[PDB]
Symmetry: D2
Subunit: 343 residues, 4 copies
């Protein structure tokens, strides 16, 4: 077993054909364009491999055994480390000027990055919903794909996404049981009391400060009490402005507030990594847009791509938005030894 | 064609075969090990493509037309940007623990990085000398290679290296003509006078401070005057402690000292990027070492051999680094009045 | 001269006071928040130092001596290396969770990043226009500043910006002289001829959907390229702030783009590249800042929304340099510069 | 307060005095040299703040409550994120050429990085032992310091280091109890049996060079693995400074390595990983510092050579955590921990 055979370099290093040269007009920088995309695709393959392995752990029930949490978080962390490298990798393609790109751009049609099967599979397997995607040229993204590739993309839409698998796990988070620690019941009561206490403090001296604090209080009150409005949540779900079930949201908040408790330490890291992956995917899209602009100019692909840099494409937006519902520590329902050892 | 066909993804994305799985014992992390190496090899191919294009510009005479210096420096800069990414790329393989690596390491034998043809081609084309390589297991590096691969490696050794092509260009640097700006003659004269003047000043509170300055002066004097010792240079060349001809060294120093002159601005950037490539190659080797250590331990010695590769022995453009040693006060630098400037 | 004295560490390392601790409730992560900002501010000071030195080289005429172009480009390159580090530096503040931030956030009011004098000085000196700034809570940016700080900001608004100094230099670019190489006149003629030739080819084809598509594309390309020679349209887009460089400076920039390999234009071209780099890195700084405000405060608190608005071409000072990609033409249409004239671009 | 007051910018941004300018010969790049060091020192202060807080958690017994492990690992992780930035930060000082550095270097004497209090405090608090430091010009590092600074450094040497505090915690790792899971007893037995089995396998092979090699390899691997159970060899390697951890702490570390997926060991394993990360990044810092001294001053006691000697395992405090890779065995040799005996490692 030789290095080159083990790595199948007879394939990897014989996959570089310049279209400019095939048409009798070799342009040096086309080689860079090819390699860059090939490297992205290798790493997309690796991300898919990690992500599919994690989906499997959830889907088959292995995640129920908490011994598997280290591997889950290590692999999700690994995805974010790869995505960071992929963001940095744009720095290489930025050494190609727009003038040099323009010398071989004509030979590219009818190819586009849009046709990256793996990029789509990745979006779908994380949990981008087809109905929420921004249309390209007034049409669905999958119409750009055909045959088995179209079929694979459909499977990736219909099979359970990372979002759905995490959701189901969040729904089982310990502590939500009304008969048990009764997290939600206690949280509602403590926030009500907390707000009442604050109001009383505010009620007494009249000044600019008071005027502001009253307004702030009213806004904070509206936000925090809205958390207990399950109907509003259902409505925002139907519009796609939220993604997690109400119960899963409760699970996530339980993990956030009790993160230090031993059984929640690695789960909290997992939630953190999920947000990280969303943020890095967005950064990838942002860096991609800025580079399309520098190469093709304004006037559109550019405008479509800019539209993808939105909360529409943030699958774990609900994990980000839990910051909105932070409260002072002393309002958090206490978890003393009496009710401590369940975690 | 369409994206997948244009990029020949039917090849690139069907090149992942886990030996652990071929032997009925699939280990998840083996996939990462394969992809990481495949990505390194794609970028090595790109570096070779840039470097060969630059060697060709020198070798075919195009570099003589100074309009081509922007392309030369852009491509060398591009090599450095790729190397930076390759250094950062170790962060991905560091997400594999030694315990997990140990689950599939057995299936790797007898394969090794030592068998990376492209890495060797890159070393050779930059200018690593075979006689200066540290031996591993009392073995020649090319012993690990056979067939047309061994042939390619031989060509890479025998064809002109980047070092040699840069050397030849440096030897033609304007300003060295004895009948012209006479850089070397004037520099020797100015440094001699400069040192004499300083000595006189030092000759003055008759204290240990004076003594210390005396000692420093004597050391600085020895260093600076050694620059004009062409025989010493030839001797250090024969040992491989320097690499550039004496004349090329003079060219480089001309570019260093007159870097702001318009004809030397982009040449100076080129010299800077050559040093950058040497620094980044060494950084790659160092990051590689630290990772071998974390995975195999000090015992498994590859670790120690690799530590040895982090040495000036593997720095092709060491002469460009060492020109820092011969910095002098600005006012000692032979003046280039616009009248003379005209040539630059 | 000792290290600590030379670096005035008695100042730098005695500037960390946690408000949480001043109010009898020390919160560990506040220290990180202070240091992070202090490090940003040190690097902003360094960016201002480089940028002021480069402004001065332009303003005082030193840039006319082309010996100084290496220093100009090295310092602008240095600014972009610093900005890259500043973008990476957000990775440190991302190790603070929103829950931990929430424990000391109350002690921060009424302080805000908006009160960073240096950040505003940097924006102004590069060339962000006051009239183009997006209002925050229907307020002017300078109203958050008073006394000498307000005065400094005003000077930074009134003094020549990097954009204006680069503009003036671009207007002097060799090759534009109608009596000389006559770049503009020749470019207009070559593009007109080039378009005419292309039209004839397409016209020769037989009516088809494909031919229509070619005709449509041709018509778009034609409109774009010929719009470049419409000086009045340029003046109009200037007045709206959709462009920033004078028409003549735009000509200079395109001259440098197309003739970048000519010796006198090699370092100028790198300068143009570094100016675009600085714009892109500034935007990336703003973007990374936004994403982190979101993670800490949530969708509304909107700060998030105002900051998202700052990530726009409205804040890109060198937008015109980016948009020269729009006007790329086949290489063979570029007016030739044989040695006959090339000598004017030798040095 | 206001931003500038809160961050004490009246201190931070009035700490830049160029010695070149004080002596009537301002050199532009000296400003960069000052700011770069000031930024390093801010981040050293932050690293000390995190490291001291973690030492305190160990020293005061708080680490005994496993609820605190998340905070411990987040802060050590944060130290490694800062160190990574500090490694990248050399890229800024690399935009200063040796020629430009040479224009102001004369004004620096007698200041040096050697005089960084915080850098020494950091080395000492992690656990660099004074007896293992390479001497520079045959002098102790502390001799470069006086007054309160010398006193601070003494405290840093005499107080419990991170190494010592982690050692004590590792010694208490669950599973080592002879009367309990008896990890060490079982590991010795399983490795002995494992080696016997392997010997039989190889001996069964047909006479071949491959067999001969496997024999030799086996003999080497056998010596290595069995040497682990030689506590006297360990004491000897301790004396020479080739190991740093007590024998029992090493057992704890290996317990965590092999049983990392067990819930109680998941975050402990991450801690071990972060300790190695910090050591690797400290070494990378020293390496990048060396390469830059070389680029500025040339090959030439020679600072270069002293510094090069610092880039070695003698300055890696947690070298033992790296070297546990030497003692990896097939998974199936690891003493089994069924739920029957799994209970003690469940939260
Ligand atoms: C010269 C550099 C590049 C240019 C000019 C460019 C241009 C474009 C354009 C115009 C689109 C919109 C679809 C279209 O109209 O064709 C697009 C989409 C895309 N590009 Fe790029 N691209 C570049 C580099 C890359 C690289 C390096 C990748 C790496 C895989 C990539 C991946 C994609 C993907 C996945 C899409 C679909 C994005 C989505 O729908 O959200 N591109 N690109
Ligand atoms: C698990 C990670 C790695 C380990 C344990 C490892 C181990 C080793 C060892 C022990 C050697 C010395 C030769 C030998 O004894 O076989 C070596 C050499 C080498 N490795 Fe790696 N390696 C790793 C990752 C990589 C990666 C990612 C690359 C990237 C292509 C690479 C490329 C090389 C090259 C080119 C050499 C020979 C270079 C020279 O002779 O200086 N290795 N490796
Ligand atoms: C916990 C981290 C951070 C949070 C939550 C945060 C929050 C905010 C918010 C809400 C604003 C909008 C103005 C306001 O409502 O007060 C703002 C603006 C600003 N922040 Fe931050 N910030 C953070 C970190 C930083 C850092 C590290 C810097 C670096 C110096 C910084 C510099 C600024 C600047 C300069 C502005 C004004 C920029 C503009 O108007 O476009 N902030 N920040
Ligand atoms: C122009 C750049 C630099 C040069 C030429 C340089 C030079 C040196 C030299 C020669 C030494 C050995 C002690 C001596 O003989 O004086 C040293 C040590 C040191 N430098 Fe630097 N240095 C540079 C940048 C930095 C930076 C940016 C830092 C950041 C704080 C730094 C921190 C240190 C430290 C802590 C030591 C002591 C290291 C040890 O003993 O292990 N230096 N430097
Ligand atoms: C592989 C192949 C091409 C690309 C592109 C890309 C970028 C700019 C382009 N301008 N024209 N084309 C071809 C057209 C084909 C039909 N769809 C619209 C674009 C381009 C392609 C980006 N990544 C690639 C990877
Ligand atoms: C491809 C395939 C393997 C490697 C290695 C690598 C890393 C650790 C190893 N431990 N044993 N072996 C096999 C031996 C055979 C050659 N002589 C010593 C090593 C390993 C191989 C690194 N890069 C690779 C790429
Ligand atoms: C220094 C000081 C504070 C900051 C902030 C920042 C971030 C989040 C905040 N939430 N409340 N406040 C105080 C408000 C006072 C009145 N309205 C403006 C903000 C915050 C301040 C970011 N960077 C800082 C640097
Ligand atoms: C602050 C101040 C100076 C430094 C240096 C540094 C770098 C290069 C030098 N060459 N000479 N000197 C002065 C000598 C005085 C003490 N003995 C050796 C050095 C230098 C100082 C690095 N970091 C600094 C921070
Ligand atoms: C037994 C369990 N692992 C419980 C569980 C569910 N979600 C969680 C989140 C954090 C901590 C634990 C859980 C399971 O049902 O999967
Ligand atoms: C005509 C020439 N380009 C002269 C030359 C040689 N080396 C240089 C270094 C810097 C500047 C110019 C040169 C050539 O012979 O290549
Ligand atoms: C003499 C001159 N340096 C000419 C000049 C102006 N802009 C340029 C751009 C590229 C090259 C040269 C110039 C000056 O007027 O500054
Ligand atoms: C009660 C305990 N936290 C036990 C302990 C010690 N070291 C460990 C390593 C991993 C897991 C647990 C421990 C303590 O004694 O600190």
């Amino acid at each position: 077993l030789i290095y080159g055979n083990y790595l199948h370099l007879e394939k990897v290093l014989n996959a570089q054909e310049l279209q400019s040269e095939t048409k009798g007009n070799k342009i040096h920088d086309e080689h860079l364009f090819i390699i860059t995309h090939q490297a992205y695709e290798l790493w997309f393959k690796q991300i898919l491999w990690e992500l599919d392995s994690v989906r499997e752990i959830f889907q088959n029930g292995h995640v129920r055994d908490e011994r598997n949490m280290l591997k889950v978080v290590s692999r999700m962390h690994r995805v974010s480390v790869i995505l960071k490298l992929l963001v940095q990798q744009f720095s290489i393609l930025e050494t190609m000027t727009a003038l040099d790109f323009n010398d071989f751009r004509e030979y590219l049609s009818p190819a586009s990055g849009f046709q990256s099967l793996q990029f789509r599979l990745l979006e779908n397997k994380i949990g981008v919903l087809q109905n929420m995607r921004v249309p390209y040229n007034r049409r669905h993204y999958r119409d750009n794909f055909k045959g088995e590739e179209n079929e694979l993309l459909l499977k990736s839409e219909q099979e359970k996404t990372l979002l759905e698998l995490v959701e189901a796990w969040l729904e089982r988070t310990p502590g939500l049981e009304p008969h048990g620690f009764n997290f939600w019941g206690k949280l509602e009561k403590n926030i009500t009391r907390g707000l009442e206490e604050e109001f009383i403090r505010i009620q007494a001296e009249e000044s600019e400060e008071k005027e502001e604090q009253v307004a702030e209080f009213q806004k904070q009150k509206e936000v925090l009490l809205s958390l207990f409005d399950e109907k509003r949540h259902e409505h925002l779900l139907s519009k796609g402005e939220r993604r997690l079930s109400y119960r899963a949201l409760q699970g996530a908040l339980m993990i956030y507030f009790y993160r230090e408790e031993p059984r929640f330490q690695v789960p909290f890291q997992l939630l953190t990594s999920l947000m990280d992956i969303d943020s890095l995917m967005t950064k990838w899209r942002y860096n991609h847009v800025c580079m399309v602009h520098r190469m093709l100019g304004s006037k559109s692909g550019y405008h479509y791509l800019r539209s993808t840099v939105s909360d529409r494409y943030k699958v774990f937006v609900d994990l980000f938005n839990l910051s909105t519902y932070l409260i002072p520590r002393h309002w958090i329902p206490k978890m003393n030894p009496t009710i401590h050892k369940f975690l």
